[PDB]
Write a structure and sequence with these properties.
Layout lengths: L14 E2 L6 E7 L4 H19 L4 E7 L5 H16 L4 H11 L10 H11 L4 H10 L3 H13 L7 E4 L2 E2 L6 H14 L1
Parallel strand pairs: 2-3
Antiparallel strand pairs: 1-3, 2-4, 4-5
Helix pairs in contact: 2-3, 2-5, 3-4, 4-5
Calcium ion binds next to strand 3 and helix 6.
């Protein structure tokens, strides 16, 4: 019972990279997941430099709600930023991962998410916090959950390179070789 092979739709999802990029890399991730924190800091920047910057890869992130209330809070904030200030999205996204502590207990609060909105985006802290309380963007989180279920996501992060499921998100050799093989095929 593993993640399913196939190309996940990135329609309506956050995207980084050129429209015409031949390879689509999708991360199914959770802002509270410590392995997603590692992916963010250690692996993603290499995909950026090696492929996204040169137009070979377009990258997308889909929310997965594996760590309870705080995962949902963070996802709702993330969805609002993508809608209201997409040019700032990836700055907010990276800084939220950077804020994840190496401790077990809950850490995600409206206050915390407001502060990030303030430092990285055009969006007003009180606006974001109002929408979190109202769960204004709930439909987007449910959309992501539907997609997660469709793809049978088991653990975060799960990385797709076109229709190929990466076995180890932390193995840059696997990711790089798989990107390169998909590029060749295109
Ligand atoms: Ca989404």
């Amino acid at each position: 019972n593993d993640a399913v092979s196939g190309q996940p739709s990135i329609k309506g999802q956050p995207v980084l990279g050129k429209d015409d990029a031949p390879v689509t890399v999708v991360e199914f991730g959770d802002y509270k997941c410590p392995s997603c924190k590692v992916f963010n800091s250690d692996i993603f920047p290499k995909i950026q430099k090696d492929f996204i910057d040169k137009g070979d890869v377009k990258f997308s992130f889909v929310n997965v709600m594996f760590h309870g209330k705080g995962s949902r809070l963070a996802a709702l904030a993330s969805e609002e930023v993508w809608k209201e200030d997409p040019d700032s999205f990836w700055d907010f996204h990276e800084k939220l991962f950077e804020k994840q502590p190496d401790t077990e207990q809950e850490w995600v609060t409206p206050g915390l998410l407001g502060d990030l909105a303030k430092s990285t985006t055009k969006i007003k802290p009180e606006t974001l916090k109002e929408n979190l309380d109202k769960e204004t963007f709930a439909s987007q989180v449910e959309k992501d959950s539907d997609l997660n279920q469709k793809m049978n996501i088991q653990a975060t992060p799960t990385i797709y390179v076109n229709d190929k499921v990466i076995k180890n998100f932390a193995d840059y050799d696997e990711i790089k070789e798989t990107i390169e093989k998909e590029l060749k095929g295109k």
